[PDB]
């Protein structure tokens, strides 16, 4: 409805179907129904538009998975709720999920912007790992390697369930996905 | 050296720096030093060139990691050698590794071609998982989910070590990366 929102929504569609460098600002503006001048006012470069979109979608994801969890104090239970809320979000938002698969861990997004998403927007993930390490449930590996690992396993499980959508309906497949996630981190 | 190889190497450079849809066949042919006619002889479409490049780099990766293994019959030891050979390859080939980060798990490559790389070129990975399950060393989850998980953990660890190249020189960082990889799969 808003000019800025039409640009962001149109950019999301095009960056997924045609890529970042495969998409021109003229195409974005036209498909959004705005003058090229209006696009550059809100976003001075195509790079800034991608960065704002990236952080925006990351914030939506973080907000959805945290709002789905009401803790009872058990870390493994909360980790399970967060994992299945993340995977549910991925199946419910196929365009935004395809955007993560393409840009979340790619050399395309500036490392500093990927850092803001990792330690800022998803800062609570490292806090849960720290709590699990302190309680003796999680192994003591470098925190940043463990968060990248959570991120890689999420992308692997969502690739799997998008490729085999019938398996997302099978509890044995879902349980196996959490087991791979938890057992990578758990103390041995 | 060969006309076909100059094209594949040029396409690799451009598909990484400018993307697939951001790169034209004219630019590829020009930068490879070949006539557009020669490009289409070897590769009838830009899609076929990406697919042949993709399978080619996957075959090089598979060949390098398998050639670096001195197996003694211990699965965990062989998995450790394969994991560190894969990460060594990623650090040694920054362009081809960036190509995997961008295309290996992305919706850009045809699912059929991603399947040929997964079950054909890297078919030995599934065989090692089956052997580990039969020996009581690896958990019994669906093998395709486990293989996607191996793939996601590799991309996460190589993202980490490319972002922090000084940590790749630290044995405790390296050991922690294998621990996350092995413990995801191992029986509990
Ligand atoms: Cl969506
Ligand atoms: Cl390279």
């Amino acid at each position: 409805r808003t000019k800025k929102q039409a640009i962001l929504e149109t950019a999301l569609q095009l960056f997924v179907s045609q890529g970042f460098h495969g998409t021109s600002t003229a195409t974005i503006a036209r498909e959004a129904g705005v003058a090229t001048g209006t696009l550059f006012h809100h976003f001075p470069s195509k790079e800034q538009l991608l960065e704002q979109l990236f952080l925006g979608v990351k914030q939506e994801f973080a907000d959805a998975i945290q709002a789905s969890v009401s803790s009872r104090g058990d870390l493994k239970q909360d980790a399970e709720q967060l994992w299945f809320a993340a995977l549910t979000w991925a199946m419910a938002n196929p365009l935004k999920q395809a955007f993560f698969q393409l840009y979340s861990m790619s050399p395309t997004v500036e490392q500093s912007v990927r850092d803001q998403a990792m330690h800022g927007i998803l800062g609570f993930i490292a806090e849960l790992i720290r709590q699990g390490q302190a309680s003796g449930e999680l192994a003591e590996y470098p925190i940043e390697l463990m968060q990248d690992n959570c991120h890689g396993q999420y992308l692997a499980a969502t690739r799997y369930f998008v490729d085999h959508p019938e398996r997302w309906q099978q509890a044995h497949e879902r349980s196996a996905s959490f087991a791979l996630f938890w057992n990578a981190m758990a103390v041995r």
Side-chain angles (χ1 to χ4, degrees), chain A residues 2-12 14-71 73-188:
Chain A
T2 191
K3 286 178 176 172
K4 209 189 174 186
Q5 194 54 34
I7 292 153
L8 283 160
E9 282 187 36
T10 291
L12 173 76
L14 292 165
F15 290 164
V16 159
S17 52
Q18 293 175 197
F20 173 79
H21 300 291
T23 299
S24 81
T25 39
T27 304
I28 301 170
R30 186 180 61 255
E31 295 278 74
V34 295
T36 46
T38 308
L39 190 145
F40 288 110
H41 170 72
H42 301 118
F43 310 100
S45 72
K46 201 174 67 178
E47 285 73 19
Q48 269 168 266
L49 174 49
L50 172 63
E51 289 173 358
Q52 291 307 298
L53 178 60
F54 181 79
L55 297 168
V57 184
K58 287 278 172 163
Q59 194 63 64
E60 285 176 34
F61 173 77
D63 287 358
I65 70 169
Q66 289 192 275
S68 299
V69 173
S70 201
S71 177
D74 185 86
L75 177 77
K76 189 185 187 164
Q77 186 190 42
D78 297 342
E80 190 178 51
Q81 293 180 72
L82 281 159
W83 174 257
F84 289 123
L87 264 51
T88 300
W89 180 95
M91 301 306 287
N93 306 272
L95 186 59
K96 286 165 186 175
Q97 175 55 28
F99 174 85
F100 282 163
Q101 211 57 266
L102 291 158
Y103 297 94
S104 275
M105 227 171 54
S106 83
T108 315
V109 185
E110 267 298 328
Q111 203 174 314
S112 58
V113 173
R114 288 194 289 110
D115 287 343
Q116 174 52 41
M118 198 192 306
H119 309 118
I121 296 173
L122 297 156
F124 73 90
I125 292 172
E127 184 47 39
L128 288 169
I129 300 162
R130 282 189 269 267
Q131 284 175 36
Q133 286 176 333
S135 68
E137 288 171 275
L138 304 181
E140 298 169 89
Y141 312 131
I143 201 97
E144 204 187 314
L145 176 54
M146 296 183 80
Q147 193 168 342
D148 281 352
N149 179 70
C150 293
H151 192 11
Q153 292 190 284
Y154 167 78
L155 292 173
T158 59
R159 166 80 284 124
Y160 182 76
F161 289 120
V162 167
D163 289 352
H164 311 285
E166 79 284 356
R167 297 190 199 184
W168 171 247
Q169 299 306 316
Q170 296 165 359
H172 83 276
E173 298 274 344
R174 296 203 303 274
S175 291
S177 78
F178 181 65
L180 286 152
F181 175 74
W182 185 256
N183 290 347
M185 301 194 287
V187 283
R188 280 203 68 119

